[PDB]
UniProtKB/Swiss-Prot annotation, chain A:
Acts as a component of the translation initiation factor 2B (eIF2B) complex, which catalyzes the exchange of GDP for GTP on eukaryotic initiation factor 2 (eIF2) gamma subunit. Its guanine nucleotide exchange factor activity is repressed when bound to eIF2 complex phosphorylated on the alpha subunit, thereby limiting the amount of methionyl-initiator methionine tRNA available to the ribosome and consequently global translation is repressed. The lineage of its organism: Eukaryota, Metazoa, Chordata, Craniata, Vertebrata. It is found in: Cytoplasm, Cytosol. Component of the translation initiation factor 2B (eIF2B) complex which is a heterodecamer of two sets of five different subunits: alpha, beta, gamma, delta and epsilon. Subunits alpha, beta and delta comprise a regulatory subcomplex and subunits epsilon and gamma comprise a catalytic subcomplex. Within the complex, the hexameric regulatory complex resides at the center, with the two heterodimeric catalytic subcomplexes bound on opposite sides. The chain holds residues 263 to 523 of 523 of the full protein. It is linked to Leukoencephalopathy with vanishing white matter 4: An autosomal recessive brain disease characterized by neurological features including progressive cerebellar ataxia, spasticity, and cognitive deficits. Brain imaging shows abnormal white matter that vanishes over time and is replaced by cerebrospinal fluid. Disease severity ranges from fatal infantile forms to adult forms without neurological deterioration. The disease is progressive with, in most individuals, additional episodes of rapid deterioration following febrile infections or minor head trauma. Belongs to the eIF-2B alpha/beta/delta subunits family. This is Translation initiation factor eIF2B subunit delta.
UniProtKB/Swiss-Prot annotation, chain B:
Acts as a component of the translation initiation factor 2B (eIF2B) complex, which catalyzes the exchange of GDP for GTP on eukaryotic initiation factor 2 (eIF2) gamma subunit. Its guanine nucleotide exchange factor activity is repressed when bound to eIF2 complex phosphorylated on the alpha subunit, thereby limiting the amount of methionyl-initiator methionine tRNA available to the ribosome and consequently global translation is repressed. This is Translation initiation factor eIF2B subunit alpha. Component of the translation initiation factor 2B (eIF2B) complex which is a heterodecamer of two sets of five different subunits: alpha, beta, gamma, delta and epsilon. Subunits alpha, beta and delta comprise a regulatory subcomplex and subunits epsilon and gamma comprise a catalytic subcomplex. Within the complex, the hexameric regulatory complex resides at the center, with the two heterodimeric catalytic subcomplexes bound on opposite sides. It comes from the Eukaryota. GO terms for biological process: cytoplasmic translational initiation; oligodendrocyte development; response to glucose; response to heat; response to peptide hormone; T cell receptor signaling pathway; translational initiation. Activated by the chemical integrated stress response (ISR) inhibitor ISRIB which stimulates guanine nucleotide exchange factor activity for both phosphorylated and unphosphorylated eIF2.
Amino acid sequence: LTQCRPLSASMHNAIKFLNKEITSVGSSKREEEAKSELRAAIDRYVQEKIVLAAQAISRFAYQKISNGDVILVYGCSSLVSRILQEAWTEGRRFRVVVVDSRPWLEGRHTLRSLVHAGVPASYLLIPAASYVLPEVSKVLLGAHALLANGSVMSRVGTAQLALVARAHNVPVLVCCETYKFCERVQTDAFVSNELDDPDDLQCKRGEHVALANWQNHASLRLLNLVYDVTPPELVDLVITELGMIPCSSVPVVLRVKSSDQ
Amino acid sequence: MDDKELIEYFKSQMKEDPDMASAVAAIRTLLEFLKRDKGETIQGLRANLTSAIETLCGVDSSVAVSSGGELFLRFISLASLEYSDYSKCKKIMIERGELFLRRISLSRNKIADLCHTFIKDGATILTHAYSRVVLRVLEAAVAAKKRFSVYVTESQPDLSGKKMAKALCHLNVPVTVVLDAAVGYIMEKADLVIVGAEGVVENGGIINKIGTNQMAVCAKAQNKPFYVVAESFKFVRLFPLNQQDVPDKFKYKADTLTGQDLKEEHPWVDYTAPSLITLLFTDLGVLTPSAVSDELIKLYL
């Protein structure tokens, strides 16, 4: 699986949990009983770490969203989309600005959902973020991982949006389930990252295609970065199933989730 | 003119036109002193004018009066450099002084015309203390069919903020008075900050009513623009390095001049560094702070 694609933080944590569960199986247990217990454990893990966690995070984030707000979201995040949809359903009225970036253009996904729920939505690319942030009252980001030092490991451009929002005096909130918290630490996006397919950087502008046969130029390199790291000083709040916590409370939460195990 | 008559003339000039600035009135009094002078030499006239400037600064301790006096001294020096004969020098001095008064009587209109276009429609403006130049700028903005809200600090201990609020209410502008301590609480609402200046120091910073420095610091913290409106005669050749480097004669009022209810004789002015200032709206146009020093470097030398 790592060869097919580098594992996400959630996948790593799930693998660690499953290995711990398997190791703690008594040798006297029958094979079918152990297999049924393992399947039940995996089902409980999915139900508690993802579904109930998402519901609790949505309930917590409902308090921050206010009437007349303009919330800026980035890319595609199921947790953020669920939070916005459940806030709209419960009676809050607000606008959402979807910031998207090449080459994945995952933000379009979010856009579609925000129209199915009836939420008014603007859409623009990341370079235009500085133009739209004067209107924005809150930035709501999803995180692929929260590191032990408080850094937010997310889709590339998340730290950019956090920086520009800080420059525009706009609060930044991060939504993450505690099952995605990690004990690793990163100080930059260079030490650990994923390099996607460089060919995805090719674009169709006009009849010509720049960067076509880019490998023919010996000095030309395409850098399709996937992740980036937001330092904790650029994040104002983290909403988890345990509530609203500062960005520096990641190491303690891990501890609380480790004393049990 | 004797000292008593000089003081009476300055006070009467201030009283007849309440909107007249202190520096302008001081310059007009200095021109009257030049007209009434009896000496027939440049050095005697310079000494008499220096004594008159000292008298006026004793009457009024604002930086504007001192800067106006220094400007008049430089003006007579420039007139004397070209012309060796004292009679023609005095005639040209009188004519150019009348022209100078006529020109600097229109500084506020130019400042308002240049600055009113920087106020976005539907914006909030934060202001410290009372300032006639800011009032004129807001008048021009209102006359241009712009709707905006104003927050004004109380500006203790003279409470000039309430006077500014009443003046703005006369113009039918939504104006709200806040405490000084609340400035950091309210900066997140203000789109921009507009303050006057009692003097523009060499580096481009300003010396203004106490509380302006912390307003500028809070604005810099939240990345809000900080705009200063000040006429050219308020330019001074001073270079303070910190708050204690400002001369004591400016901090403490004319009539004003331990460890137990001392209060250390609360200062009336503080210094705001040029790094906290976005732009200046002078009668010479819209300037960066670094331009201010230029206007002085070319003025002398």
